[PDB]
Amino acid sequence: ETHINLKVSDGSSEIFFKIKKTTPLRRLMEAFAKRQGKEMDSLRFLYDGIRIQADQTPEDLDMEDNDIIEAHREQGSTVVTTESGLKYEDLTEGSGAEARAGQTVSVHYTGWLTDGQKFDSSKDRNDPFAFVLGGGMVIKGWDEGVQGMKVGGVRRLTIPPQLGYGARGAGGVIPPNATLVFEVELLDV
Ligand SMILES: O=C(NCCOC(=O)[C@@H]1CCCCN1S(=O)(=O)Cc1ccccc1)c1cccnc1
Numbered sequence: 001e002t003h004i005n006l007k008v009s010d011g012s013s014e015i016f017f018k019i020k021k022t023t024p025l026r027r028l029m030e031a032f033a034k035r036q037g038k039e040m041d042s043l044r045f046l047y048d049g050i051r052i053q054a055d056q057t058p059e060d061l062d063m064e065d066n067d068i069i070e071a072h073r074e075q076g077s078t079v080v081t082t083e084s085g086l087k088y089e090d091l092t093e094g095s096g097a098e099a100r101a102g103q104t105v106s107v108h109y110t111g112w113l114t115d116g117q118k119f120d121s122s123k124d125r126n127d128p129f130a131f132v133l134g135g136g137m138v139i140k141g142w143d144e145g146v147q148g149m150k151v152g153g154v155r156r157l158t159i160p161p162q163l164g165y166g167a168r169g170a171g172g173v174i175p176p177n178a179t180l181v182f183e184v185e186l187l188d189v
């Protein structure tokens with residue numbers, strides 16, 4: 001009928017929007033940006049690999065129900081896979097001091113399963129998280145993945161289970177053999 005359901009993915013989670021096919025996608029982009037506490041200028045929305053302009057409507061773009069829009073936060077994106085199998089991507093490259101093994105770094109983070117279900121966030125507690133980098137106090141993917149970040153940076157870590165909670169998983173919310181996705185913002189080193 002008159003309306004269309006669109007999925008918007010940012011590489012970490014996915015949420016749906018229902019809008020009129022004749023409504024300009026600006027409102028969707030605004031609702032997505034305001035939800036993630038981000039400025040509209042800082043986001044790029046892509047459909048069929050082509051960047052969406054806010055004046056364009058789903059009808060203009062011949063969108064179908066349950067089509068996917070990608071929201072990107074970075075400058076060409078680069079996903080690095082290290083020798084351990086850890087994957088990381090700098091969404092924002094910081095410009096302050098560099099985090100190295102042995103330093104106590106303070107961060108905000110959100111963690112999701114690879115299906116998009118959030119399992120924890122320091123932002124939910126309104127409380128930054130600090131740890132000794134390389135100190136064996138966090139999962140291996142974090143001791144490796146946070147090194148090299150600079151203050152002000154946001155880095156997305158994709159952690160295979162052997163660098164996370166392994167075959168066992170953790171508690172009630174981390175399943176066995178789970179790959180973990182974290183977005184980590186370095187606040188202080
Ligand atoms: O959990 C804490 N310390 C244990 C070590 O944690 C970790 O190595 C990873 C990576 C570093 C940040 C947190 N986590 S996590 O994957 O989000 C843990 C988790 C799993 C399932 C549900 C909720 C939370 C902890 C202590 C003090 C304040 N805040 C968190």
Ligand SMILES: [Ca+2]
Nearest residue numbers: 127128129130
């Ligand atoms: Ca704290």
